[PDB]
């Protein structure tokens, strides 16, 4: 992250939020949510407000929940999107982990 | 050989998970002077029921965050173990037959961390290994 590292996650989150699709058939948005979001959470070098990170995590969680609830297109590629691009692994669990990580970095069956 | 009747459901479930290392467990009922092999559910349906299970709450030796105790411990199945079915859920839990691990808050009892480990006699390997390595096998 030398040229532009702070806005890498920001652009991906903005694109995902602007898409606003119940079915996550968008290759770029889904791939960005899957890859850039974990990298953004891990990368503490870029200084950004906690509110922006929380909003990005909430948008990612909403997109993941929408993808899980909506009908997809056996484990194989979708009829219209590549397998790697549209793949989302454990949407609710990943969203919960991302939210917990964000809360940690924001100055602190019948389980719940 | 012994002429025996095996229920259609159990017979189909034999290769439903045993087509590709496999086993068949059932109960034989020598009732009405005839031999009728059935699963445990049909054994209950035949006719003294008293179910025995394991749902142990091993006092976890790992003393870390709530996230570590709940959302990290439960992923200990896929390490080396085998002959266990895989079903994916977004919410987060391991539900392979009579197995549930996401119990409650990490420490409700006034002591160390407490987590409920549940298993049955057919899947005793997973529950036994989990309880063994959770009693003292996960130090800080």
Q: What is the DSSP string of A24-91?
A: ---HHHHHHHHHHHHHHHH--SS---HHHHHHHHHHHHHHHHHHHHS-------BTTB-HHHH--SSH
In chain A, which residues are followed by a C-to-N distance beyond 2.5 Å, i.e. a gap?
73, 108
Distance from CA of B50 to the nearest CA of A (A): 24
- What is the DSSP pairing of strand B34-38 with strand B5-6? parallel
Q: Which residues of A touch B105 (CB under 8 A)?
A: 111
CA-to-CA distance for B133 and B140, rounded, in angstroms? 13
Whole-Å CA distances, B46 to A106, B59, B139: 60, 39, 48
Q: Which two tokens stand for residue B91?
A: 């919410």
B45 is an annotated ligand-binding site residue: no
CB < 8 Å to B88, chain A: 90
Whether the CB of B86 is below 8 Å from some CB of chain A: the reply is no
Given an 8 Å threshold on Cβ–Cβ distance, is B71 in contact with A97? yes
Test B104 with A111 for CB contact under 8 angstroms: yes
For residue A86, give both structure tokens: 């549209």
Residues of A in contact with B100 (CB under 8 A): 109
Token reading at B96? 């392979």
| Chain A residues near residue B71 by CB distance under 8 angstroms | 93, 96-97, 100
Q: CA of B67 to nearest chain A CA: how many angstroms apart?
A: 8
Question: To one decimal place, what's the resolution in Å?
Answer: 3.1
Rounded Cα distance, B24 and B10, in Å? 9
Contact yes or no for A78/A25 (Cβ under 8 A): yes
Is B122 within 8 Å of B96 (Cβ atoms)? no
SS3 B73: helix
Report d(CA A62, CA A95) in Å as an integer. 9
A91 CB burial (10 A radius; 0-12, 13-18, 19+): buried
Q: Assess B100–A contact: CB distance below 8 Å, yes or no.
A: yes
**CB contact at 8 A, A60 and A13:** yes
């Amino acid at each position: 992250v030398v040229q532009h590292g702070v806005g890498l996650g920001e652009a991906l989150l903005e694109a995902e939020t602007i898409e606003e699709q119940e079915s996550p058939v968008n290759c770029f948005r889904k791939l960005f949510v899957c890859d850039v979001l974990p990298l953004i959470i891990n990368n503490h070098d870029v200084r950004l407000p906690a509110n922006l990170l929380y909003k990005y995590l909430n948008k990612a969680a909403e997109f993941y929940i929408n993808y899980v609830t909506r009908s997809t297109q056996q484990k194989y590629i979708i009829e219209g999107l590549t397998e790697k691009s549209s793949q989302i692994v454990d949407p609710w669990e990943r969203l919960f982990k991302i939210l917990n990580v964000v809360g940690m970095r924001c100055e602190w069956y019948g389980d719940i | 050989s012994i002429p025996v009747g095996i229920s259609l459901g159990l017979l189909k479930r034999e290769m439903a998970q045993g087509l590709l290392p496999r086993l068949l467990h059932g109960t034989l009922i020598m009732k009405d002077s005839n031999f009728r092999l059935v699963s445990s559910e049909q054994a209950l349906k035949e006719l003294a029921e008293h179910q025995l299970r394991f749902t142990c709450r091993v006092h976890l030796h790992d003393t870390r965050k709530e996230q570590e105790t709940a959302l990290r411990v439960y992923s200990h199945l896929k390490s080396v173990l085998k002959d266990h079915c895989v079903q994916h859920l977004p919410d987060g839990s391991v539900t392979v037959e009579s197995v549930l691990l996401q119990a409650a808050a990490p420490s409700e009892d006034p002591g160390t961390k407490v987590l409920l480990v549940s298993w049955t006699y057919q899947d005793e390997e997973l529950g036994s290994f989990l309880t063994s390595l959770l009693k003292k096998g996960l130090p800080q």
